[PDB]
Amino acid sequence: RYRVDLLNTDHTLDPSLLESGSEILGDLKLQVLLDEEYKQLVKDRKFLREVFVDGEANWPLPVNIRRIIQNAQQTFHIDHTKPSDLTIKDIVLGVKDLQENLLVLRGKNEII
Amino acid sequence: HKLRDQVLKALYDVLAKESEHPPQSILHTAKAIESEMNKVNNCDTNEAAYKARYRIIYSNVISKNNPDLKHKIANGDITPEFLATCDAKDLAPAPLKQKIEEIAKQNLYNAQGATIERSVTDRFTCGKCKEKKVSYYQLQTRSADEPLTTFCTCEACGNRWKFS
Amino acid sequence: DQENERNISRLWRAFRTVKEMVKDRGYFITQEEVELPLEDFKAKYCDSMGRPQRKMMSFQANPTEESISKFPDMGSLWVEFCDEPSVGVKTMKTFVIHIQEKNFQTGIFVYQNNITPSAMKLVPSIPPATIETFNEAALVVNITHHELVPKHIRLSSDEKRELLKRYRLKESQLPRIQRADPVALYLGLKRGEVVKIIRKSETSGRYASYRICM
Amino acid sequence: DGPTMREITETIAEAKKKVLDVTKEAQANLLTAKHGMTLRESFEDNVVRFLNEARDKAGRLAEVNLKDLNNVKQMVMAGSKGSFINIAQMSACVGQQSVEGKRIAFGFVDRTLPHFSKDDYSPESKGFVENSYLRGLTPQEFFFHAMGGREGLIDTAVKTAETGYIQR
Amino acid sequence: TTFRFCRDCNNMLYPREDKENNRLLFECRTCSYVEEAGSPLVYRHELITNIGETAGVVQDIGSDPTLPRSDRECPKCHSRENVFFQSQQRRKDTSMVLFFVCLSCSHIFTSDQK
Amino acid sequence: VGVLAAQSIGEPATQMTLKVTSGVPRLKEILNVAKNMKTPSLTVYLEPGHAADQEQAKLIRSAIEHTTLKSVTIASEIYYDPDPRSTVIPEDEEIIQLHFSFDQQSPWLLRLELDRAAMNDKDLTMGQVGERIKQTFKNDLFVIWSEDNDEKLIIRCRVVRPAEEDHMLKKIENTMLENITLRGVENIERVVMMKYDRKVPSPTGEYVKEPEWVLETDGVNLSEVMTVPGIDPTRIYTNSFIDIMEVLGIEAGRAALYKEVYNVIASDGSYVNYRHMALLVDVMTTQGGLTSVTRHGFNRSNTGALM
Ligand SMILES: [Mg+2]
Ligand SMILES: [Zn+2]
Ligand SMILES: [Zn+2]
Ligand SMILES: [Zn+2]
């Protein structure tokens, strides 16, 4: 599901999915970014398997993701053919942007 | 030398008392001294467990059931083997043996407990694994203004739920 | 064999639990030392066939570099296993005089069975040195390795003062923890100390918490 | 449908036959004597499991026979009120009424009610309910039905005061 | 195990031991009658019993109408009539063994075959 | 939030049912401790090195469960045997020279017989229990016992001291039957083995329902049950949350208490959000100790007089 390897063979993306995807095949910087977020995800997987011994998927949580991206699809009318105008750089920075921008506790000190 | 004379006299008695007579009395006291000198090799009359193994082998000989232990111990089944055996359950006799394994089977069964079996059907669908292996069960809880609850549980994974 | 072997095994496990207690209280022990094999301990500390000689394998220990980095005042600690079933007043008197002569401030004592209150009355003597007693059967099992108890961690008085001036509390509304708690005797803390506790929460995983010793 | 009615009848009948076979095996003293519980308790577990399997197999057959223009089937798979258990309960069989899991206790000496002969554990004897609602009842089944209902009413009327106290 | 009474005076006999002849002599505590004991058994506690399923039989059990009737025969007289009924002991672990009493042979027999 | 939590936890208590105590009185006893249990059940998992070894499981149950003499006593008779070194009973005569290969004793024989099956179900032989009854006095009781392999296991004992026999010997009989422990730990009763399963991470990296063997009981102790070998000391668990508090610590106590109340209210009519139940559990535990919400319990605190 999640392994992407921009210079290797088996888990390589199809460059029909991105216009700026053919030429970047083999770039070191993008590969380093993908590998470090991959390591982030696998350490998260280890953490979750620790904090639930059973392996239950369904859990109570705040705001849904599935339906909100579903209505995003059906409002901005995605097609089945056009490679997106996205960049890997934009995605991997914007997720960490939103990650810090979630703000529950206003404060300044180390403990907060 | 009280123990090393007393057990030697005990083996003198329990080998002369046999229907297998001792004309090879020198062979039989050689067997007795071999028995006692391997018998001390656990303890050397310095451990309290000496008398226990002696009581085991002694009353196994004087058991009758069986008397054939005397014949097999005089015609073989050497005495330094029969400290390290500890085969008291294993010998004298085999009908009592097969009795003991029937007893052990009965106890191992009876120590098992309650295993209510939760009859299943495919009528509903689980929440966790979404399988139709619903360990359903039916009962009434609330007041008179309604029928039963339609209690639910999945047996494929363990997921309990309820239907409205 | 009879219960000689399980007595040896229980002493081995108690020795284990004491070693990890001294480790996670912050004193420099090799972590490999706690998985010493049972047969190796049996060969190492039995006299001839089955008798462990509990007086001699008692040992000294020193604070870690990180322990000195956090706190400026821990002298060396010293442990003991008597062989007497109940504990004699003169025996523990010689023990506490040895502690004072060797200039230690933490008393770590293990009793086989009950101790007379005439020994217990002079236990809180010689301040600032502190004395503690454990049972082997109370320490046959390392309590932290039970999965239900969360992690525990100690604080500095500086960090406590920082916490109080940050959350604008005053020393009393913060939730308590009894001195006679098993984790309290495990950490050896006294009154006025603050314990941070991290447990595996089910809506955020890691979750801060705080207790004050009373 | 009448052929489905006689299928319900023979299903209950073969359940009674297997119950009679198990009772005969008990009465000739050779049984498993299942682990954990007592000999009588295993006998009770057996007969309860057999009769519940009879009841819901009958209910499954009745529901799958029932037509697509049946309005109360339309009601129940439409949702709001009633259930499969409701339809089966009203239409095919009731199942053994009971108080606290055990079936209807030996109130009088040696038997259940004074109206049968002595020392019986048959589904009539303890009073497994044979009939549905529609064909009627026998007075014994009427009495056992009143027993289970009255138990429900008394437990509700005590538990309401206790739950009010603990809530407050 | 029974409790003998002094034949001179119907009173509870007690065991008491001879001082030198080493025999139990049941001496009466009322009168001076004494009697030697047949066995060295004196007292018996019996912490486990399983008994009482059978008795209470009168010679006309079948005269009562309420007992059910069957067609298994008595295996002495071969008459097909019978009266059957369960155990007369009621513990929470008594068995579903049955007792069959007839009128012709007037005999009690069971249905166990272990 | 606490008021909303209170009303949320209060709503489904009206839809309750009434083996193992459940329902309203179990909920009331849990919420309103009552240093009293009515169900002393404790769960024990084995060492994971023993997965499905039934002989190991019965060895463990034999190690843990307390028994008495009355667990194995059936035949308990009394005798007058005049000769101290020759039996009047013709069956016990070889045992005289079995123990004979210290005279000034009463010529009164107490005699005990046990069951073979009820002896070795718990895996004890008679020699060590004859040793045990020998060593518990060694001064007053001259104690003789047979071999294991005899058809009827017998104990022969006498009172030794250098008229007035029957009532003394009867009381000593009653004492040895009522008091002498054999193995295990007392206040623990019959123990049974369920074939549970457990969701376990697969070695290839998935999950699998894998069987294992467990121990359940009808008695409560904590200070001794992790001591015995072959036991996981970590994953032990008991319903009796006060003992878990006392042995482990208050954080483990509030975790166990929340687990117990979640099981009881999730038996039917489930569910509620975790936060309400957690708030209740932690506000009831946040005083360094357990505190039932009674007229006396939480109210006798530094709390304002009008509430
Ligand atoms: Mg106030
Ligand atoms: Zn499921
Ligand atoms: Zn008289
Ligand atoms: Zn006949």
UniProtKB/Swiss-Prot annotation, chain A:
<comment type="function">
    <text>DNA-dependent RNA polymerase catalyzes the transcription of DNA into RNA using the four ribonucleoside triphosphates as substrates. Largest and catalytic component of RNA polymerase II which synthesizes mRNA precursors and many functional non-coding RNAs. Forms the polymerase active center together with the second largest subunit. Pol II is the central component of the basal RNA polymerase II transcription machinery. During a transcription cycle, Pol II, general transcription factors and the Mediator complex assemble as the preinitiation complex (PIC) at the promoter.</text>
</comment>
<protein>
    <recommendedName>
        <fullName>DNA-directed RNA polymerase II subunit RPB1</fullName>
    </recommendedName>
</protein>
<comment type="subunit">
    <text>Component of the RNA polymerase II (Pol II) complex consisting of 12 subunits. Interacts with DEF1; the interaction is direct and serves to bridge RPB1 to the Elongin complex in a DNA-damaged dependent manner. Interacts with the Elongin subunit ELA1. Interacts with the Elongin subunit ELC1. Interacts with ASK10. Interacts with ESS1. Interacts with RTT103. Interacts with SHE2.</text>
</comment>
<comment type="similarity">
    <text>Belongs to the RNA polymerase beta' chain family.</text>
</comment>
UniProtKB/Swiss-Prot annotation, chain B:
<dbReference type="GO" id="GO:0001193">
    <property type="term" value="P:maintenance of transcriptional fidelity during transcription elongation by RNA polymerase II"/>
</dbReference>
<keyword id="KW-0539">Nucleus</keyword>
<dbReference type="GO" id="GO:0006362">
    <property type="term" value="P:transcription elongation by RNA polymerase I"/>
</dbReference>
<dbReference type="GO" id="GO:0031440">
    <property type="term" value="P:regulation of mRNA 3'-end processing"/>
</dbReference>
<dbReference type="GO" id="GO:0045899">
    <property type="term" value="P:positive regulation of RNA polymerase II transcription preinitiation complex assembly"/>
</dbReference>
<dbReference type="GO" id="GO:0005634">
    <property type="term" value="C:nucleus"/>
</dbReference>
<keyword id="KW-0479">Metal-binding</keyword>
<dbReference type="GO" id="GO:0001139">
    <property type="term" value="F:RNA polymerase II complex recruiting activity"/>
</dbReference>
<dbReference type="GO" id="GO:0031564">
    <property type="term" value="P:transcription antitermination"/>
</dbReference>
<dbReference type="GO" id="GO:0006383">
    <property type="term" value="P:transcription by RNA polymerase III"/>
</dbReference>
<feature type="domain" description="TFIIS central">
    <location>
        <begin position="3"/>
        <end position="119"/>
    </location>
</feature>
<keyword id="KW-0805">Transcription regulation</keyword>
Curated annotation (Swiss-Prot), chain C:
<dbReference type="GO" id="GO:0005634">
    <property type="term" value="C:nucleus"/>
</dbReference>
<dbReference type="InterPro" id="IPR035913">
    <property type="entry name" value="RPB5-like_sf"/>
</dbReference>
<comment type="similarity">
    <text>Belongs to the archaeal Rpo5/eukaryotic RPB5 RNA polymerase subunit family.</text>
</comment>
<dbReference type="GO" id="GO:0042790">
    <property type="term" value="P:nucleolar large rRNA transcription by RNA polymerase I"/>
</dbReference>
<dbReference type="InterPro" id="IPR014381">
    <property type="entry name" value="Arch_Rpo5/euc_Rpb5"/>
</dbReference>
<dbReference type="GO" id="GO:0005666">
    <property type="term" value="C:RNA polymerase III complex"/>
</dbReference>
<keyword id="KW-0690">Ribosome biogenesis</keyword>
<dbReference type="GO" id="GO:0005665">
    <property type="term" value="C:RNA polymerase II, core complex"/>
</dbReference>
<dbReference type="GO" id="GO:0005736">
    <property type="term" value="C:RNA polymerase I complex"/>
</dbReference>
<dbReference type="GO" id="GO:0003677">
    <property type="term" value="F:DNA binding"/>
</dbReference>
<comment type="function">
    <text>DNA-dependent RNA polymerases catalyze the transcription of DNA into RNA using the four ribonucleoside triphosphates as substrates. Common component of RNA polymerases I, II and III which synthesize ribosomal RNA precursors, mRNA precursors and many functional non-coding RNAs, and small RNAs, such as 5S rRNA and tRNAs, respectively. Pol II is the central component of the basal RNA polymerase II transcription machinery. RNA polymerase complexes are composed of mobile elements that move relative to each other.</text>
</comment>
<keyword id="KW-0804">Transcription</keyword>
Curated annotation (Swiss-Prot), chain F:
<feature type="cross-link" description="Glycyl lysine isopeptide (Lys-Gly) (interchain with G-Cter in ubiquitin)">
    <location>
        <position position="259"/>
    </location>
</feature>
<comment type="function">
    <text>DNA-dependent RNA polymerase catalyzes the transcription of DNA into RNA using the four ribonucleoside triphosphates as substrates. Largest and catalytic component of RNA polymerase II which synthesizes mRNA precursors and many functional non-coding RNAs. Forms the polymerase active center together with the second largest subunit. Pol II is the central component of the basal RNA polymerase II transcription machinery. During a transcription cycle, Pol II, general transcription factors and the Mediator complex assemble as the preinitiation complex (PIC) at the promoter.</text>
</comment>
<comment type="similarity">
    <text>Belongs to the RNA polymerase beta' chain family.</text>
</comment>
<protein>
    <recommendedName>
        <fullName>DNA-directed RNA polymerase II subunit RPB1</fullName>
    </recommendedName>
</protein>
<comment type="subunit">
    <text>Component of the RNA polymerase II (Pol II) complex consisting of 12 subunits. Interacts with DEF1; the interaction is direct and serves to bridge RPB1 to the Elongin complex in a DNA-damaged dependent manner. Interacts with the Elongin subunit ELA1. Interacts with the Elongin subunit ELC1. Interacts with ASK10. Interacts with ESS1. Interacts with RTT103. Interacts with SHE2.</text>
</comment>
